[PDB]
Structures are given as C-alpha cells and as structure tokens.
Design a protein around this ligand. Structure first.
Ligand SMILES: CCC(CC)CN(C[C@@H](O)[C@H](Cc1ccccc1)NC(=O)O[C@H]1CO[C@H]2OCC[C@H]21)S(=O)(=O)c1ccc2c(c1)OCO2
Lengths: 99, 99
C-alpha cells in the first residue's frame, strides 16, 4: 500500500500465531513489542529511546506477517509505550519513504 | 525522492537559521529538535517514548525546510538525542510510506 501520515501508520501484524496492532516506525532501528510470550531462546538486551534506556528480551529469527507481507527477524520484547515495527523489518517488507 | 531504510532516514533541515540533520520519523506524532535557543513564545510539554518522558518547549508556527521542501508548524525543543521530524511536518512535505 501507500500510507499517508495524517494518522498514525498502524497496521495489523501476526506473530507467534496472534494478531496485534503495531506502528510502522521509521525512526526505530529495531522492532519492539509490548510484553508478550514468544517461544524459544532469548537474550537480555538494553535499548535507548527518547526518555532513557529499557531492558528488553531479544528473540532472533522470528517470523512476523506485517500488513500481509512476510518478515523473519529480530524482535525485542519489553516496556515500549506501543508496539513498533522498526527498520530491521521495514526493509524486509520493502518499505520506503517517498515524497 | 525515495528513501530506503537500510540506514537511518536522516536528512538536512533548516530551522531558526541553523542547518541540522534530522530523522524522517513516521513513529513521531510531533517534531522534536535538540536544544536550541529559539526566539518567541512557547508552552511546556512532556512527551513520552522508550525510557519515559522528557520535558520540551513547544513553539508554534515555526518555518522549517526539510530536504528542500518548505514546512511550517509546531516544533518541540528539548533534550532529545536526535532531531526528529514527525508526522505534523511529514504530511506537509508530501511524505508517504510505500510497500
Ligand atoms: C510512541 C512511539 C515512539 C516510541 C517507540 C515515539 N518516538 C519516535 C521513535 O521513532 C523514536 C525516535 C528516536 C530515535 C533515536 C533516539 C531517540 C528517539 N525511536 C525509538 O524509540 O526507537 C527505538 C527502537 O529502535 C531503536 O533505534 C532508535 C532508538 C530505539 S519518540 O522519539 O519517543 C517520540 C517522538 C515524537 C513524539 C513523541 C515521541 O510523543 C509525541 O511526539
């Protein structure tokens, strides 16, 4: 699709078998989801945002369907204010900015 | 132009007589610039992200040129680690997400 920006670019995603809403976030290097269970191994990690640093769980090579497009990549889980799809997966689905 | 997301979508902006590098950020409702002593009236605000909130100064109807395109609107000034162009100005320069 082409998505304009007068509203938040929210889309439905499918991960670990479950549907969620997430924000397409070009300012995010990484994809960060709110607290949830995912299967398999994870690593403790820390990431920083506008307000400071948080602790997250890093899950690698996780399949995620984003607005109908498949990605498989790193998903961080932790206390983000909202679910965000970052550039690591935006690149996978062929997302670009255009003006 | 079309901007891929392999790297941070940083572009040159001009504001208050200074040139800066800023993220084209679809995850940002508002535009948030690193501390700078702009003239004029302002109002206090708090904005939240990963890590928590920061205190910013809200300035209205500030002209800003983004990658050669003119815009004018609200800019928040405060201790952000990166200059952030949010949707309030992305819409004004005709920016969309495409995949
Ligand atoms: C609520 C949705 C986002 C937070 C999730 C909002 N952020 C914009 C993001 O794009 C920031 C923009 C940002 C970018 C770098 C540093 C600080 C902020 N990115 C961000 O936090 O990314 C993190 C995930 O990947 C990592 O790579 C970048 C930092 C990490 S924000 O910077 O906190 C932000 C910006 C404008 C706003 C706002 C909050 O509230 C109202 O207006």
């Amino acid at each position: 699709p082409q998505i304009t920006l007068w509203k938040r670019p929210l889309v439905t995603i499918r991960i670990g078998g479950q549907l969620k809403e997430a924000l397409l976030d070009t300012g995010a290097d990484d994809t960060v989801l709110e607290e949830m269970n995912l299967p398999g191994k994870w690593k403790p990690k820390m990431i920083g945002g506008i307000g400071g640093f948080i602790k997250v769980r890093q899950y690698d090579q996780i399949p995620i369907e984003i607005c109908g497009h498949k990605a498989i990549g790193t998903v961080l889980v932790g206390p983000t204010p909202v679910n965000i799809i970052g550039r690591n997966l935006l690149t996978q689905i062929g997302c670009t900015l255009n003006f």
